[PDB]
Design an enzyme around this catalytic site. Sequence first.
Site, short mmCIF file in Angstrom:
data_model
loop_
_atom_site.label_atom_id
_atom_site.label_comp_id
_atom_site.label_asym_id
_atom_site.label_seq_id
_atom_site.Cartn_x
_atom_site.Cartn_y
_atom_site.Cartn_z
N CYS A 1 62.53 14.28 14.98
CA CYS A 1 62.52 15.59 15.62
C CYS A 1 62.02 16.64 14.63
CB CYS A 1 63.93 15.91 16.11
SG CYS A 1 64.18 17.58 16.75
N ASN B 1 61.89 22.22 20.37
CA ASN B 1 61.27 20.94 20.05
C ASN B 1 60.59 20.33 21.29
OD1 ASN B 1 63.83 20.34 21.32
ND2 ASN B 1 63.55 18.22 20.63
N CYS C 1 61.73 18.15 23.48
CA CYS C 1 62.61 18.01 24.64
C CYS C 1 63.46 19.25 24.97
CB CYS C 1 63.49 16.78 24.49
SG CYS C 1 62.55 15.25 24.32
N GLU D 1 65.90 21.00 23.53
CA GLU D 1 67.33 21.16 23.20
C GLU D 1 67.57 21.65 21.77
OE1 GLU D 1 65.90 18.30 22.85
OE2 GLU D 1 66.95 17.03 21.41
N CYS E 1 66.00 17.96 12.69
CA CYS E 1 67.35 17.78 13.20
C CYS E 1 67.69 16.32 13.37
CB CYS E 1 67.53 18.53 14.51
SG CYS E 1 69.26 18.79 14.93
N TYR F 1 63.89 22.34 30.82
CA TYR F 1 63.11 21.16 30.54
C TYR F 1 62.42 20.71 31.84
CZ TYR F 1 62.02 16.74 28.14
OH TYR F 1 61.40 15.65 27.59
N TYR F 2 62.41 19.41 32.14
CA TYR F 2 61.64 18.89 33.27
C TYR F 2 61.99 19.53 34.60
CZ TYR F 2 60.58 14.59 30.59
OH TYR F 2 60.16 13.68 29.67
#
Lengths: 146, 578, 728, 16, 16
Positions: free
Chosen positions: B72, B278, B280, B282, B303, B571-572
Site C-alpha cells: 500500500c 490509496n 482502495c 481506506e 501502511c 469506493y465502488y
Amino acid sequence: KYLVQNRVTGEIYESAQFLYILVAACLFSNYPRETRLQYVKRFYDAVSTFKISLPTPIMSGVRTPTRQFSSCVLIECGDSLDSINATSSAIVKYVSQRAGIGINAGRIRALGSPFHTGCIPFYKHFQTAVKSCSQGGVRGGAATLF
Amino acid sequence: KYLVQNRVTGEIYESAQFLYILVAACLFSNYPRETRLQYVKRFYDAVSTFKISLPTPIMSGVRTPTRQFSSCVLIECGDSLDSINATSSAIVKYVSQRAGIGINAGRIRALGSPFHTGCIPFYKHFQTAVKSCSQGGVRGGAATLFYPMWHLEVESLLVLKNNRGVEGNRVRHMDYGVQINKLMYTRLLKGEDITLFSPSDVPGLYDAFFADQEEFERLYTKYEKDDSIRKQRVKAVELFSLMMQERASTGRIYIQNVDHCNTHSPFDPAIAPVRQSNLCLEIALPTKPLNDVNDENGEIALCTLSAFNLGAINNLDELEELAILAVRALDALLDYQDYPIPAAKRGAMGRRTLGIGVINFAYYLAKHGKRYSDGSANNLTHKTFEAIQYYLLKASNELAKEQGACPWFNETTYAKGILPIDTYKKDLDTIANEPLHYDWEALRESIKTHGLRNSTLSALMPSETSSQISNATNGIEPPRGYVSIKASKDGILRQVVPDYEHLHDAYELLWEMPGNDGYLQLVGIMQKFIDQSISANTNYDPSRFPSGKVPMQQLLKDLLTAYKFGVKTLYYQNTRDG
Amino acid sequence: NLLVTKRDGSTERINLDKIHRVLDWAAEGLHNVSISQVELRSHIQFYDGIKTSDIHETIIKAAADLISRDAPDYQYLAARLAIFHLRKKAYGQFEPPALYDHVVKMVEMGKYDNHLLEDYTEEEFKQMDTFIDHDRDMTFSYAAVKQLEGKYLVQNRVTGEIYESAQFLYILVAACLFSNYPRETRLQYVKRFYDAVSTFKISLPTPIMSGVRTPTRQFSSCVLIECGDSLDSINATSSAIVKYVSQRAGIGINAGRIRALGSPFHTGCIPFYKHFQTAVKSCSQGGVRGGAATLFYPMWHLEVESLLVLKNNRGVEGNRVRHMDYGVQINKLMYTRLLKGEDITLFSPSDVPGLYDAFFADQEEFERLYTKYEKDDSIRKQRVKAVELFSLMMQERASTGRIYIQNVDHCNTHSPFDPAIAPVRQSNLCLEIALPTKPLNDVNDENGEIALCTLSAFNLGAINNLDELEELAILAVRALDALLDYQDYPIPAAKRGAMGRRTLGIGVINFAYYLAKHGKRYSDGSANNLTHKTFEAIQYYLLKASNELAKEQGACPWFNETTYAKGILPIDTYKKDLDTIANEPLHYDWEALRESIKTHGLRNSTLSALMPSETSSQISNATNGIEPPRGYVSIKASKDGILRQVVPDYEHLHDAYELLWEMPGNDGYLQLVGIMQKFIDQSISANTNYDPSRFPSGKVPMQQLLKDLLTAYKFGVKTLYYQNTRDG
Amino acid sequence: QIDSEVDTDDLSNFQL
Amino acid sequence: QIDSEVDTDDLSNFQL
C-alpha cells in the site's frame, strides 16, 4: 518558425538578414577580436547566400535568451529498473525541449526470464515518456527504438 | 497463495500451522527472552483461531528470505518534470514488488498554462509506470489517481475511463478519486456555478482546499472575482452529474471529501495534511512530493494492514489482547521489511502508520439479530467500533511507554490531547445514542504524556482472500448471496456464509437492502472512531426504479447523505446486472 | 435531536408520535399491514433539517413500495397517507373548507367557472355541502390517488400547487351538469349523481372529470370525420382535424372515397393520408406525442395492397404512413370469396357508381353491382386471390397490432340507424363508436356532419344487482345529455351531428372482476347467459332513461332517422347465430318499451358503446373495460416511484380470475363480445390475443388468425380492435 | 413470426 | 442507463 515573433499577438520583430548576422555574431562571439568579425562576415555570407543550412532550433533560437538547441539525442537503456527509470526520465526532459530520440532498449531481458513480464510493458512506458509533452495523443515527441 | 511451495514442480513444503507459528516467531523475534515465546504463543493462537487476519504478503512471505511486504503506497506528485519523473520511477519500483498505488496528481498544471500540454499525457505516463511490470498491459499493478473537482481540466479528467472516446483523451486502466469539500456541495445545493482553476494560477488555494476551509472560501471567492486569473465556469449541477454518470457507468470513479479527512483526522493539517487516499480509498495519510527518486525530503506514505474477525470474538473486551498482538506484530514488521525508496522509509519510520480493520461484519450483525438497512445496527456499531479504536489506541499507547512514541508523534492531533471523539461529524448524534463505555479521558492524558507508537491504527479495507481463509463475510460488506462461487482449475469453488443453517433469515443480502441510507449511517458511525477511512460502497438495483433506470436525483442524494454523516471516501459503485 | 423544517421555514423538532398516529389512522380496517415496517423504511431516510413535505412523501412512498398481492391493503394505506398530504397541500389542514367558501375562493382565483356562483345561491352550496362525504376520499387506492393528483384535481402546473380534493371535484361536476334543472328536482339530481360517481358506480372520461367546473368548454374527445373525393373536402377534413387535435381529441377518419392512383387524384391516396397524419400530429410535441387517429378504407379499394402495409417499419418513406392506425372495412361477400378460395376484384370508388354506398347500406345491391362491374371490361380493375389479400391484412394486423377490422354490413343491419338515410360508414380511433357522417366541402360547411360521442361507463363491480342500473342509467344519460348543450363546438358540422342525434356511448368497466365474483370465466362459455342477462339490463335501462328524457324534454331532432323510430329494436336485428350460444330469456318488457319509444322517442340516437379504459378503471380500482387482466398486479412508471395496483379482491378471488394468457383461445371471449353486441347500440373495442408458446414451433398460424376473424363475423361482432401478441 | 400455411379446404366448410 | 433528471429545488433543502 524562423523569425523572432510574438506567437500570442502575431507580431514579427525582425527580418531575415538580422537573423543571419546575429546567429553569426552569437556563434563566433568568443573569438579573438583579431579574427572575430572576419568569421562573422564569412559565416553571414555563407548562410544568407544559402551555401550552409542550419537546423530550425539554431535558426529560431540563436540570438534569443534560450540555450535549448539539442534536437538529436541517443539514449541506451540497461537491463535494470534503475536504468529503465533513468532512461524514461531523460526522455521526458529532452522531449520537453523538442528533441527527437533514439532509444536502445535491446538489452532488456525477454518475457519469462529469472522483468518476468518482458520488453513490451517497458516499451509502452518509453512511448508515454516520448509523448509526455505532446498536445494530446500524437502531435509532438518522436522516437525510434532499437 | 499462502503455503511455501515450488511453482515449477508444484511441490508443497509446509502446512498451515507451521505457517502461523513461524510468522509469529519472525515478527516477535527481537523481543526479550522474558516475554518472547509468550507473545509468539498468543499471536499464534490469535491467527490460527482466525481472530486476527493478516494480508497476503505477510502470510506468504514472513519466514522466507523475502523482505518485500509493502502493498500500500501513497505518492504525491509535484508540478515539475523532476517530480513527475520521481513519481513515475517510484511507481515502477513499487509495482515490481506487487504494491497498489495511490497517486496524487492534482497539482499538475492545466493544459495551456504558461505543462503547456496538460495533465493527460502525464497521467498516461503514470498508467504505464503502474503497468510496467504487468503481463500484457493489464494483469498486475494497480493505481487510483486523485485530483480536485475544481481543476481546470476536470471535465476531461472525469471521462478518462469512458470506453467510447478518442485514444489521446482516455486513460482507462487506472481508477480515479475526485476530491470535494463543503463549498463544492453548497454550489450544488444552491444551483450555482463552480469555477475551475489551474492550481498554478491560484496561490494558496490548493493547500487551503485540504487544510483550511475558511481560507479556501476566502481565496476561492477572491480568485473568482479577479478577472486576471484564467478560469472556466460550469454549473455545479452539470459537473456533479458528469462525475456521477461516470461513477455509475464504470463503478470506479471515487469520491474523497477532503475537508472531512482533515477536520476529523489523527493529523494536524497545518503540519501534515491528508491530501489523497490509496487504491482502495481506506488509507488517509500525509505525503510530500519528491524531486528525485532518492529525495530525502520527500514523503511517500506506507501502511501495514490487518483485521479483527468480528465473528470469532465472543465479546468486545477480547479486543484488548488482540489489539496488543496485532499492533505489536505489525509495528515489528515496520523495522523488518525493506524500503526501495528513501521517501517511503521516511514515512514509515517517522509515523509508523498502521491500518487495522475488520472482517465478518455482516455475520456479526446477523448473529446479534441486526440489519444494515433499517438503523437497527446503529448502536451496536457505535459500541463495537468504540471498543476497536479504544483498545487499538491503548495497545499503541502502551507500546509507546515501552519502546517510545513515533518520531513524528508531535505532528498528530493525538499529541495535542485531541481524540476522534472530539472531532467527529456532529450529525451522528442524531442517529445513535449509545454512550461511550470506555475511559477516554484517562486515555487522552495517557496519550498526551506517553504518546503513540503509531500515528494511525485503524482503517476499514475490503477483503476477499483473508475472509475466505476464515470463512468470513468480506470486510464490512453484506454478502451478495448465501453461496460464493469462484472459477478454479480444480473445479467450481463454493463457499457458504458462516452459520447459514441457523442464520439464513438473520442475514441481509446486498440486494435485499431497499437503499443505501442504513449502510451509510453505519459507515458514518464507524468513521467517528476510525483513524483513516473506509472503503464504502454504494449499491443500486435498476429493477427497484421506474423504467429500470437509476435516477441522478438518488445518486446525488446518497452522495449528500454520505457527506452529512461525515463519510470520508466513497469506493465502488455496484450496479446489479439484470 | 432531528430538526424538521416547516412549511413556513421555521425549524421545529421531529414528532415521531404524531407520524405514528397518522399511520395508525391510515391503517384502520386494513389487514396484513405493518406500521413499524413503514416507519423503519422511511425513518432511515430522514435527515436533520428535512422539510415536512419530504417526510410526508417519504412515508407515502414507503407504504407504496410494500404493495404486493400478498399484502394488497398497502394500496389503501399509501392512498390515505397521500390523501392526507393532499388535504394539507390544498387547505392547510385535513378538514376541507365549507363548499361555498371553497367555490368563492376558486372563482376569485379564476380556477372555477363563475357560472357556479350565478346558478346556485350560498344556501344551495350549504345544502350541497351536506351531501358531501369527505371520508369517501379514504376509499381510493394508491394508483387512483396518483391519477387524481396528476390528471383530475384542479392545480397549477407551474408551481405544483393543488387546489381541490376529490369530493369537491365530484360534487361540482354534478352541480355543473345539472345546473339548468328546475328547483324542484335540481339538488335531488345533484345529490344522486354525486353519490353515484363518488361511490364509483359511474365513471366519467378525463376531459369531464378534469374540466367540468372550470372555465373550459372543451370536452369533445371522440370525433368522426368523413372525407369526400375532392380537394375541397380533403382540405376541410384536414382543417377540422387540426382544430380538434388542438383540443386533445381522438379522430376517426373515413378516407375510403378518395380515388385510386392513376384515375383520370392522379397521384392517389397515400400523399393525402400523409397530409391527414400531419394534421393529426400538428399539435403534438415531436411528431408523435399527442394527437391520434384511425383511418378507414374498404378492402376492395384499388390501392388496398399498398394501404395494408402503411405501418410496416421496413419500406420506402413515400409508401409509409406509420403514425396513424387503420381500419379495413369488410362485408359478407369478401369473406365468401375467402371461404370459396376465389378472387376479390379491386376497384377505385370513382369508377363504380353506387358500389361504395351499397357496400354499407345494401348487401343485395352491393352484390348486384359488384358482379356487374366485375364482368364489365371497360371498368378499371385489379384481381387478387382472396386468400392472399386476407393473409396480407392479417400479417400486418399481427405485426403491428394496429390494423383493425370493421364488418360494415353488421354495422348497418344491426344498428340504431336506418342505413338508407343515415348509414354507419366508419368508426372512431378505438373502434367502439359507430355513427353517421357526411363529408364537408369547407371547414364551415353547414351541410356536413362530423359525428361526436360523449362517453361514460357503469362499474359492474360496484353494483349489488342489475336493477340498480335503472337509477344509474337515468343519472348517466341525463348528465351527458346536459353536457351536449354545455360543451363548445369548434366546427359547425360537428355541432350538427351532436345537436341532431345527441349520441351517447355508455359502456362498462370491471367486467372481469364481475365474472370472477359470479364464479364465471371468459374462455369456456360459462359466462354466456350471465353476459346476456347483464347487457339486456344495461341496454333496457339506458333506453328507458333516454325514452323518459324524451317525454320530458323532447326526442332528438333527427330521431326519425333511427330504426328505433320505426319500432325496431336491437332484439329484432341481432345476429341469429347467437341463439345457438345462449338460452337466457329476456327479463324485461321490451314490447312495452318498443311502443313507448315509437310514441315518445329517444332523447339520444345511441346510448351504448363498449370502450377501452385505463385511467377511469384505475380510479375505481376496476379491471379495464371488458378485458381480462394480464396479471394480478399492474405496474406503471412514475416520477414518484413504481406504481402498483392489485386487482380488486385478489385475496378471495385469485383463483376465480382468469388472466389474459390463461385463456386457451379467443373463442369464449368472442362469444361474450357477440352476446354483448346483441344489445349494444354502437360497437365494442374487441381484442384478439395470441400466445406464440401455445403453438408448434412458436409461431401463430394464419389458419387460426383467419378462423378467429370468421368466428367474430359469425357471432355478429362489428369491429376488431388491438391484436395482442404475448412477448416471449 | 407467423406461419403462412392456409388450408382453404378447412375454411370452405365454415358458414358465415 | 441512468435518468438524468435533477430536481435542484428538492436538493436546496438539504443541510450538509
